[PDB]
Amino acid sequence: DVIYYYQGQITVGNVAPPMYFAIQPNGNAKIGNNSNVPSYINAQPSSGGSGFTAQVNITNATYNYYFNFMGLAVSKTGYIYLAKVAYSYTATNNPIQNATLYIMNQQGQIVYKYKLIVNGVVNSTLPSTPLQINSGSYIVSLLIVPYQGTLPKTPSNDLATITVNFGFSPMTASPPPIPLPSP
Amino acid sequence: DVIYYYQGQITVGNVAPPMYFAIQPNGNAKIGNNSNVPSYINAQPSSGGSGFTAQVNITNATYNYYFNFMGLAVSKTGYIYLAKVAYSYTATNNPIQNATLYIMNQQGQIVYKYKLIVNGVVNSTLPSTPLQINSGSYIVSLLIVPYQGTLPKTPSNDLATITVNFGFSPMTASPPPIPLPSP
Amino acid sequence: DVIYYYQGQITVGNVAPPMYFAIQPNGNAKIGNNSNVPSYINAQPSSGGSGFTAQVNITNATYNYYFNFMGLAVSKTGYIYLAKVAYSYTATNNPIQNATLYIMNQQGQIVYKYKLIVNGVVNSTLPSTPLQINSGSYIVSLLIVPYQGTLPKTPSNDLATITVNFGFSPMTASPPPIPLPSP
Amino acid sequence: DVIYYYQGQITVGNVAPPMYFAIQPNGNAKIGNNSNVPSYINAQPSSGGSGFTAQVNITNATYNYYFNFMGLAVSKTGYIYLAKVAYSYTATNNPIQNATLYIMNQQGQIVYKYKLIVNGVVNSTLPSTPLQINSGSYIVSLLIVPYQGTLPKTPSNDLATITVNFGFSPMTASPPPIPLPSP
Amino acid sequence: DVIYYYQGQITVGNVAPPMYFAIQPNGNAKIGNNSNVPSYINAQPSSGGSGFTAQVNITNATYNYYFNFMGLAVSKTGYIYLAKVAYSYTATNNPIQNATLYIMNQQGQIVYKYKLIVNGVVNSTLPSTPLQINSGSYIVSLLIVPYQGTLPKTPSNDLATITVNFGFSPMTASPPPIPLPSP
Numbered sequence: 001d002v003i004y005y006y007q008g009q010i011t012v013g014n015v016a017p018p019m020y021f022a023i024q025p026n027g028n029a030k031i032g033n034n035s036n037v038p039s040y041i042n043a044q045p046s047s048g049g050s051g052f053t054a055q056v057n058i059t060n061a062t063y064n065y066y067f068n069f070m071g072l073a074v075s076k077t078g079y080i081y082l083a084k085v086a087y088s089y090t091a092t093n094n095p096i097q098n099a100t101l102y103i104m105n106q107q108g109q110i111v112y113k114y115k116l117i118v119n120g121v122v123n124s125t126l127p128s129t130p131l132q133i134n135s136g137s138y139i140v141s142l143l144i145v146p147y148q149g150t151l152p153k154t155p156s157n158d159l160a161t162i163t164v165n166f167g168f169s170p171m172t173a174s175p176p177p178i179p180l181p182s183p
Numbered sequence: 184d185v186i187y188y189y190q191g192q193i194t195v196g197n198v199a200p201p202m203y204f205a206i207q208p209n210g211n212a213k214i215g216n217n218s219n220v221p222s223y224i225n226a227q228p229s230s231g232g233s234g235f236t237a238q239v240n241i242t243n244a245t246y247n248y249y250f251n252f253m254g255l256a257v258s259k260t261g262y263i264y265l266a267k268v269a270y271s272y273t274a275t276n277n278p279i280q281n282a283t284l285y286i287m288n289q290q291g292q293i294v295y296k297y298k299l300i301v302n303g304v305v306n307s308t309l310p311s312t313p314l315q316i317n318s319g320s321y322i323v324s325l326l327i328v329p330y331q332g333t334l335p336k337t338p339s340n341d342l343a344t345i346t347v348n349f350g351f352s353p354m355t356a357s358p359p360p361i362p363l364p365s366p
Numbered sequence: 367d368v369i370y371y372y373q374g375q376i377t378v379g380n381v382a383p384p385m386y387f388a389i390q391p392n393g394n395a396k397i398g399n400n401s402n403v404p405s406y407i408n409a410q411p412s413s414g415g416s417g418f419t420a421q422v423n424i425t426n427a428t429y430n431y432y433f434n435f436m437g438l439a440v441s442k443t444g445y446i447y448l449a450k451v452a453y454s455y456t457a458t459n460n461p462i463q464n465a466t467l468y469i470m471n472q473q474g475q476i477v478y479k480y481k482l483i484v485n486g487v488v489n490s491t492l493p494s495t496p497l498q499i500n501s502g503s504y505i506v507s508l509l510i511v512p513y514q515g516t517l518p519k520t521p522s523n524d525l526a527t528i529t530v531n532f533g534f535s536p537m538t539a540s541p542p543p544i545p546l547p548s549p
Numbered sequence: 550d551v552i553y554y555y556q557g558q559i560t561v562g563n564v565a566p567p568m569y570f571a572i573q574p575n576g577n578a579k580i581g582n583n584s585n586v587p588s589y590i591n592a593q594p595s596s597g598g599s600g601f602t603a604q605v606n607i608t609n610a611t612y613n614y615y616f617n618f619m620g621l622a623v624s625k626t627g628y629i630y631l632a633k634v635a636y637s638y639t640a641t642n643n644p645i646q647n648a649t650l651y652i653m654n655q656q657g658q659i660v661y662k663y664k665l666i667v668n669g670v671v672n673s674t675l676p677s678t679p680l681q682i683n684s685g686s687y688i689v690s691l692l693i694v695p696y697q698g699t700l701p702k703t704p705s706n707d708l709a710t711i712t713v714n715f716g717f718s719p720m721t722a723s724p725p726p727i728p729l730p731s732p
Numbered sequence: 733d734v735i736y737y738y739q740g741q742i743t744v745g746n747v748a749p750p751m752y753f754a755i756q757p758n759g760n761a762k763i764g765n766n767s768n769v770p771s772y773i774n775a776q777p778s779s780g781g782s783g784f785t786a787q788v789n790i791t792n793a794t795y796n797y798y799f800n801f802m803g804l805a806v807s808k809t810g811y812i813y814l815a816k817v818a819y820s821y822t823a824t825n826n827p828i829q830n831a832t833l834y835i836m837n838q839q840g841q842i843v844y845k846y847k848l849i850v851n852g853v854v855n856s857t858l859p860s861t862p863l864q865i866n867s868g869s870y871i872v873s874l875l876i877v878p879y880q881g882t883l884p885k886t887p888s889n890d891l892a893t894i895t896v897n898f899g900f901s902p903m904t905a906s907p908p909p910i911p912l913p914s915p
């Protein structure tokens with residue numbers, strides 16, 4: 001048998017993140033200041049600012065809104081998009097009608113709106129178009145619209161889970177909407 | 184292209200509502216007992232107490248008053264405000280001059296007054312200041328002042344519609360007046 | 367911050383009035399026929415029958431009586447009461463000792479007597495008890511007792527003003543005496 | 550509960566009286582000149598000419614006559630009637646058989662005769678028919694016929710009291726005989 | 733002593749490569765166009781297309797993805813496999829959790845997935861099964877999943893190195909998975 005071998009050599013270095021999740025980034029007391037309300041939300045930046053984790057309590061309210069629960073810091077200009085969403089629930093009936101995640105200016109204006117879940121199903125059109133985002137820092141906020149009547153009378157900690165991936169690229173020109181592979 | 188992906192994970196739990204709309208909450212026969220007068224008003228709490236729906240018949244009377252048409256139960260202390268109002272009418276002429284919604288003590292004293300419509304237009308100053316409301320239960324009542332001469336001689340079911348959103352926050356300290364986003 | 371939003375939706379329809387003020391209601395030439403005596407009284411039903419407006423000239427007579435100045439039509443049985451009275455005067459001295467407003471049967475019998483002003487002050491006991499009134503039509507008449515010596519020698523158009531609100535409810539069972547709020 | 554409120558607004562002005570009681574009206578030295586005879590009669594116009602008050606001493610005479618004790622001035626033509634009479638006495642026996650009040654022309658002719666009391670009782674047919682009276686001024690006179698034997702030997706100031714109400718209307722056409730209500 | 737000598741004679745010729753690494757192979761502007769993003773990746777084909785060299789900057793992002801950083805051209809059909817992987821790092825803590833290298837169709841579909849590093853260690857099952865690959869050209873892309881918290885705050889050029897050997901055989905029938913010897 002004849003085998004030809006081709007050698008790839010990859011050297012790995014380390015660079016400061018183009019964007020990261022944080023509480024009060026750069027000491028800005030207006031960005032990400034509602035990470036923790038002692039029976040209703042508990043959110044934290046994932047290790048090294050790599051993402052975020054949130055425990056979120058919905059109720060009977062027709063809109064449940066988690067304003068400024070995280071801060072998004074962007075160190076260098078680039079293009080951002082919603083790359084992937086995954087949704088699952090433990091209940092007999094689907095608990096969420098609509099879930100939307102907002103990136104917002106410090107003055108509370110919406111910069112970008114990301115529909116995660118629509119009429120009870122994940123956004124089907126993903127990955128979304130890469131849109132430019134400027135350097136600075138942004139309020140990030142979550143809105144949930146439950147399906148009324150489906151929420152149990154007895155409280156619970158594990159009604160549903162939403163996993164979301166944002167893709168960011170630090171390029172000068174817009175990339176295609178690249179979908180995130182399985183590792 | 185280089186894409187960096189950041190993962191948000193949101194776990195959703197369920198909590199008993201800080202406030203809810205109800206008829207005779209906790210069996211209190213004095214709160215919300217006028218939800219239904221068989222040709223003049225028909226009001227109901229929206230599913231799970233998430234809000235309310237009312238069909239309301241105005242007449243030629245210079246003030247039309249719907250006393251105790253709903254009950255508001257508040258399970259834990261918090262801050263309440265008028266977040267958003269929307270108003271529209273099907274007639275050629277605007278039917279309503281003033282519409283005001285009252286939260287009232289069990290003794291019929293006004294706790295808070297919410298002007299929904301003033302001189303024929305929605306309240307422009309919204310969202311209103313968050314004000315503290317104590318735990319307990321409250322009478323809620325609607326006053327409408329028509330524009331006389333505009334109401335048709337023949338009855339109708341769809342003269343106008345008023346949509347109102349109350350924001351409530353279960354925090355110890357007052358929030359900013361956060362406006363409700365579009366989903 | 368966590369905000370829970372609760373949505374009220376009010377749909378407004380239109381219904382023929384349970385009672386209204388009119389001149390010669392249903393063409394009845396005996397009800398409300400003294401709305402206009404060309405130097406002494408000029409009364410009219412407010413727009414759509416929503417109430418009434420009267421210009422009323424008092425004189426030196428010890429009783430000044432305005433018989434049948436308005437007609438009250440009641441289309442459906444219900445409970446009526448005097449909800450609120452407001453009184454003010456432009457003169458140096460209080461011009462009115464007693465003012466009383468009567469609802470009367472077609473045969474001139476008194477059905478209900480409403481004391482608006484007593485010994486120069488508004489009725490303090492208001493709102494009055496809701497009393498049943500049958501469908502049909504009623505003479506309405508005003509009696510004023512001036513304070514003699516207080517009326518100026520020179521005539522005037524704006525000596526005093528009396529504002530009165532009647533509450534009517536089309537319910538089968540008597541309501542509490544609900545006071546009219548400020549809008 | 551549903552309450553409909555109807556607003557009456559009454560604005561009160563002031564007008565020179567269509568008729569009034571006076572002593573020597575317009576300076577006419579023939580009208581009302583016997584208001585005061587120093588042990589037998591003392592009569593005065595009530596404040597602003599609104600009526601009259603008289604202290605009247607009867608004696609053993611079979612007719613007691615108080616000629617021209619008041620003057621009646623009529624500024625504009627209208628219809629006059631005896632609206633109400635009330636009579637009471639402090640004695641054991643009824644002191645008066647007949648009491649009659651006359652409106653008289655300046656020449657002493659009777660224009661109208663008002664029987665107040667007949668055979669010891671008030672006129673039962675009241676209110677009387679409205680009759681036209683012309684502008685000008687009139688003598689007014691009282692006749693009393695006692696029941697002899699009933700008057701005490703010792704004089705007294707409070708044997709009996711007669712209260713009389715005249716209705717006047719300044720209309721061109723005759724009204725019905727409207728009875729004066731209780732305030 | 734008796735020595736028997738056996739003569740091997742090897743004549744060496746030269747043949748166009750069955751596959752090679754390239755930027756935009758055959759002028760195809762869609763294959764290998766992300767070899768260079770000026771602070772995040774710098775990749776080049778090794779001399780004569782014999783392999784590739786890449787400098788790759790990871791950050792705090794939970795997935796770091798280097799899409800289309802090289803082009804793989806395959807001139808004749810054959811069988812390809814991952815022959816050998818070697819991994820080392822200069823840091824105190826292991827920087828990489830998972831590293832995966834993808835061969836992809838021009839439409840961005842995954843043809844083959846090569847797990848280089850899994851849970852911080854090199855793939856232990858190597859050499860992998862030879863799988864057929866058709867003639868044409870392929871996108872090649874690298875995904876790295878760091879261990880968060882391990883990456884230093886100060887940037888560096890030499891955090892880790894990954895050396896990878898792909899074996900290719902131009903035979904019609906699949907060979908055994910032959911491991912690459914040390915020279």
Ligand SMILES: *[C@@H]1O[C@H](CO)[C@@H](O[C@@H]2O[C@H](CO[C@H]3O[C@H](CO)[C@@H](O)[C@H](O)[C@@H]3O)[C@@H](O[C@H]3O[C@H](CO)[C@@H](O)[C@H](O)[C@@H]3O)[C@H](O[C@@H]3O[C@H](CS(=O)(=O)O)[C@@H](O[C@@H]4O[C@H](CO)[C@@H](O)[C@H](O)[C@H]4O)[C@H](O)[C@H]3O)[C@H]2NC(C)=O)[C@H](O)[C@H]1NC(C)=O
Nearest residue numbers: 029030031032033068106107108109139357358359360361
């Ligand atoms: C946590 O981070 C939050 C980020 O949202 C902060 O919320 C912001 O609070 C401001 C005032 O907060 C004070 O009062 C609250 C109680 O109400 C306390 O909880 C706080 O501790 C603090 O004491 C609020 O500002 C409003 O009030 C100001 C006076 O105090 C007044 O100057 C402002 O104009 C507001 O009325 C923020 O609200 C936003 O303010 C911006 C202007 S600025 O950024 O404040 O300068 C407004 O933008 C204007 O909007 C118009 C459009 O209508 C634009 O044309 C114009 O260009 C732009 O300036 C927003 O409309 C207004 O909503 C409020 N932030 C948001 C996004 O609502 C909170 O304070 C932080 N808490 C702590 C403890 O750090």
Ligand SMILES: *[C@@H]1O[C@H](CO)[C@@H](O[C@@H]2O[C@H](CO[C@H]3O[C@H](CO)[C@@H](O)[C@H](O)[C@@H]3O)[C@@H](O[C@H]3O[C@H](CO)[C@@H](O)[C@H](O)[C@@H]3O)[C@H](O[C@@H]3O[C@H](CS(=O)(=O)O)[C@@H](O[C@@H]4O[C@H](CO)[C@@H](O)[C@H](O)[C@H]4O)[C@H](O)[C@H]3O)[C@H]2NC(C)=O)[C@H](O)[C@H]1NC(C)=O
Nearest residue numbers: 212213214215216251289290291292322540541542543544
């Ligand atoms: C439905 O829910 C309604 C809630 O408003 C109830 O209305 C309340 O009705 C009370 C009596 O109702 C009875 O009579 C009506 C007919 O009139 C029937 O329809 C009912 O079925 C029932 O049979 C009424 O109380 C009044 O009457 C009482 C005697 O019966 C008397 O003790 C009260 O004082 C009242 O005069 C409610 O009216 C309010 O009462 C409170 C006191 S309390 O809450 O009743 O104890 C008053 O507050 C006082 O006010 C002063 C200020 O002036 C304060 O300083 C003082 O602290 C405070 O106590 C209110 O002024 C007075 O209006 C009446 N509720 C309201 C808000 O008006 C209705 O009953 C319910 N119907 C059914 C069938 O459940």
Ligand SMILES: *[C@@H]1O[C@H](CO)[C@@H](O[C@@H]2O[C@H](CO[C@H]3O[C@H](CO)[C@@H](O)[C@H](O)[C@@H]3O)[C@@H](O[C@H]3O[C@H](CO)[C@@H](O)[C@H](O)[C@@H]3O)[C@H](O[C@@H]3O[C@H](CS(=O)(=O)O)[C@@H](O[C@@H]4O[C@H](CO)[C@@H](O)[C@H](O)[C@H]4O)[C@H](O)[C@H]3O)[C@H]2NC(C)=O)[C@H](O)[C@H]1NC(C)=O
Nearest residue numbers: 395396397398399434472473474475505723724725726727
């Ligand atoms: C405007 O509306 C007014 C409403 O009050 C009308 O007033 C009513 O006028 C009747 C007659 O009017 C005629 O004469 C006047 C001049 O006097 C003109 O201005 C009118 O244009 C018209 O030409 C008057 O009726 C009286 O006269 C009748 C004969 O003409 C006689 O049959 C009546 O009995 C009266 O004497 C109204 O007076 C009331 O009448 C009722 C009976 S009914 O309703 O007329 O049938 C009486 O009720 C009786 O009373 C006893 C108690 O004592 C009860 O037991 C019994 O059950 C009941 O029948 C009233 O006592 C009596 O006062 C008079 N209405 C009132 C309330 O006084 C006016 O006509 C209208 N004008 C126009 C132009 O339309």
Ligand SMILES: *[C@@H]1O[C@H](CO)[C@@H](O[C@@H]2O[C@H](CO[C@H]3O[C@H](CO)[C@@H](O)[C@H](O)[C@@H]3O)[C@@H](O[C@H]3O[C@H](CO)[C@@H](O)[C@H](O)[C@@H]3O)[C@H](O[C@@H]3O[C@H](CS(=O)(=O)O)[C@@H](O[C@@H]4O[C@H](CO)[C@@H](O)[C@H](O)[C@H]4O)[C@H](O)[C@H]3O)[C@H]2NC(C)=O)[C@H](O)[C@H]1NC(C)=O
Nearest residue numbers: 448476477478479480481482484489490491492494495497
């Ligand atoms: C403010 O204005 C109110 C009306 O607008 C006045 O209310 C009236 O109160 C009368 C007694 O008021 C006294 O007592 C209260 C304490 O309760 C005090 O606050 C007052 O200062 C005052 O001292 C009340 O009258 C009742 O008692 C009378 C004996 O004194 C008696 O003659 C009456 O019959 C009553 O029982 C009034 O109650 C209603 O009266 C009407 C008739 S009318 O309006 O008075 O002419 C009745 O209607 C009758 O009902 C029967 C059936 O039962 C029918 O067949 C009939 O055809 C019909 O006439 C009601 O039944 C009766 O409830 C009351 N009036 C009203 C209309 O509510 C109040 O006093 C004023 N306040 C002040 C400070 O001046």
Ligand SMILES: *[C@@H]1O[C@H](CO)[C@@H](O[C@@H]2O[C@H](CO[C@H]3O[C@H](CO)[C@@H](O)[C@H](O)[C@@H]3O)[C@@H](O[C@H]3O[C@H](CO)[C@@H](O)[C@H](O)[C@@H]3O)[C@H](O[C@@H]3O[C@H](CS(=O)(=O)O)[C@@H](O[C@@H]4O[C@H](CO)[C@@H](O)[C@H](O)[C@H]4O)[C@H](O)[C@H]3O)[C@H]2NC(C)=O)[C@H](O)[C@H]1NC(C)=O
Nearest residue numbers: 577578579580581582583616617653654655656657658688
């Ligand atoms: C107070 O007001 C009283 C109103 O009645 C005045 O009474 C009227 O007094 C006249 C004369 O008074 C003089 O004399 C008395 C003593 O007797 C004094 O007290 C007075 O101060 C005063 O000095 C009196 O007139 C009579 O006398 C006249 C001559 O002095 C003579 O001209 C008259 O004709 C009388 O005889 C009034 O009597 C009435 O007079 C009218 C006419 S007029 O109005 O005087 O012009 C007569 O009417 C005529 O009658 C016929 C019918 O028979 C008709 O057809 C004809 O058209 C009509 O003219 C009356 O019949 C006659 O009674 C007398 N008034 C009355 C009503 O009797 C009194 O003077 C005043 N006092 C003061 C101080 O001011």
Ligand SMILES: *[C@@H]1O[C@H](CO)[C@@H](O[C@@H]2O[C@H](CO[C@H]3O[C@H](CO)[C@@H](O)[C@H](O)[C@@H]3O)[C@@H](O[C@H]3O[C@H](CO)[C@@H](O)[C@H](O)[C@@H]3O)[C@H](O[C@@H]3O[C@H](CS(=O)(=O)O)[C@@H](O[C@@H]4O[C@H](CO)[C@@H](O)[C@H](O)[C@H]4O)[C@H](O)[C@H]3O)[C@H]2NC(C)=O)[C@H](O)[C@H]1NC(C)=O
Nearest residue numbers: 631659660661662663664665667672673674675677678680
């Ligand atoms: C209560 O008091 C009332 C007056 O305050 C009395 O009314 C008067 O009734 C007289 C007749 O009464 C009899 O009939 C009724 C039934 O209808 C019964 O209830 C009574 O008990 C009694 O039996 C009436 O008189 C009329 O008839 C007379 C004949 O008997 C005749 O002489 C009169 O002329 C009348 O036709 C009264 O009617 C008015 O009278 C005045 C004059 S006066 O007041 O009587 O002196 C007339 O004025 C005249 O009018 C003309 C123009 O037409 C002028 O030119 C002239 O200058 C002027 O004098 C009226 O025209 C006439 O209508 C009547 N009086 C009044 C003032 O209304 C009642 O009887 C007393 N009730 C009791 C129980 O005692």
Ligand SMILES: *[C@@H]1O[C@H](CO)[C@@H](O[C@@H]2O[C@H](CO[C@H]3O[C@H](CO)[C@@H](O)[C@H](O)[C@@H]3O)[C@@H](O[C@H]3O[C@H](CO)[C@@H](O)[C@H](O)[C@@H]3O)[C@H](O[C@@H]3O[C@H](CS(=O)(=O)O)[C@@H](O[C@@H]4O[C@H](CO)[C@@H](O)[C@H](O)[C@H]4O)[C@H](O)[C@H]3O)[C@H]2NC(C)=O)[C@H](O)[C@H]1NC(C)=O
Nearest residue numbers: 174175176177178761762763764765800838839840841871
């Ligand atoms: C560098 O090389 C890259 C190789 O990946 C190129 O990426 C490809 O870009 C296409 C469009 O690029 C244009 O827009 C971007 C900004 O977004 C600029 O950077 C570029 O310069 C350029 O201007 C992109 O195509 C998409 O957009 C097209 C419209 O412009 C549209 O026709 C396509 O359908 C895409 O939506 C490529 O994305 C892939 O396209 C293929 C089809 S095709 O190969 O384009 O014809 C899709 O395959 C389809 O997928 C379904 C499964 O869902 C299959 O059933 C079906 O058979 C198949 O056709 C892919 O799903 C879609 O992702 C994009 N390539 C990839 C792999 O994503 C880049 O352009 C090159 N840049 C330069 C400057 O040369």
Ligand SMILES: *[C@H]1O[C@H](CO)[C@@H](O)[C@H](O)[C@@H]1O
Nearest residue numbers: 171172173174768769770
């Ligand atoms: C940003 O600049 C890069 C070069 O670094 C280009 O590749 C891109 O097209 C954009 O101009």
Ligand SMILES: *[C@H]1O[C@H](CO)[C@@H](O)[C@H](O)[C@@H]1O
Nearest residue numbers: 036037038354355356357
């Ligand atoms: C209520 O308490 C919370 C902590 O749960 C504070 O954030 C707030 O300022 C108020 O004191």
Ligand SMILES: *[C@H]1O[C@H](CO)[C@@H](O)[C@H](O)[C@@H]1O
Nearest residue numbers: 219220221537538539540
């Ligand atoms: C009239 O009827 C209504 C029902 O429409 C009841 O609520 C009331 O008690 C009265 O009987």
Ligand SMILES: *[C@H]1O[C@H](CO)[C@@H](O)[C@H](O)[C@@H]1O
Nearest residue numbers: 402403404720721722723
């Ligand atoms: C007097 O005139 C009035 C109009 O002012 C009429 O109502 C009445 O009938 C009489 O003719």
Ligand SMILES: *[C@H]1O[C@H](CO)[C@@H](O)[C@H](O)[C@@H]1O
Nearest residue numbers: 001902903904905906907
């Ligand atoms: C491809 O063809 C070769 C001959 O060149 C065989 O050895 C092999 O088995 C496959 O058929």
